[PDB]
Amino acid sequence: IAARDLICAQKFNGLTVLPPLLTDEMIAQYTSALLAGTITSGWTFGAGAALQIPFAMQMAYRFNGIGVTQNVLYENQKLIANQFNSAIGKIQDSLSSTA
Amino acid sequence: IAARDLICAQKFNGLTVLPPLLTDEMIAQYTSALLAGTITSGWTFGAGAALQIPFAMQMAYRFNGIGVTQNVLYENQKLIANQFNSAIGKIQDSLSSTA
Secondary structure, rough: HHHHHOOOOOOOOOOOOOOOOOHHHHHHHHHHHHHHHHHHHHOOOOOHHHHHHHHHHHHHHHHHHHHOOOOOOOOHHHHHHHHHHHHHHHHHHHHHHHH | OOHHOOOOOOOOOOOOOOOOOOOOOHHHHHHHHHHHHHHHOOOOOOOOOHHHHHHHHHHHHHHHHHHHHHHHHHHHHHHEEEEHHHHHHHHHHHHHOOO
């Protein structure tokens, strides 16, 4: 159900993140909301164009999620790199001593 | 040619993915289509505002591509991690036995 995307959106300790994986009904509802907002923007003078707010909200949430996942992956790669370097150095030293 | 982006868009076994790398003419055509859609939304009552559909379609495709690439990278990192752990354990055991 695409309606349970915004009302049940996960968050972070100080931010809000969402996975970048969409669905057919999800993008269909997004396009319908965007079309409704663009239609109401041309016939309303007040705050009737507020239908495009949740679209940008979920877009920013997915962007923040992608960013934090990229940061986690970068930290994990740095950890793996330094651990591999230290292990290879120690193994080389041990092999030289044994030889 | 930016026109060969939507008509020659790759897909997946059950989804549709696109690389997040854009170009100058690509973003120019996207902005032109968005402006045309926003102009037609204010002067048409029927389905004339359908010019913003391919924009959201390619956006969702790029999001799904980023998501599946992130998932592949996460699986690869998990594989590398467990393989490194097992190899380091076996190497430590062999070195202890040899010593």
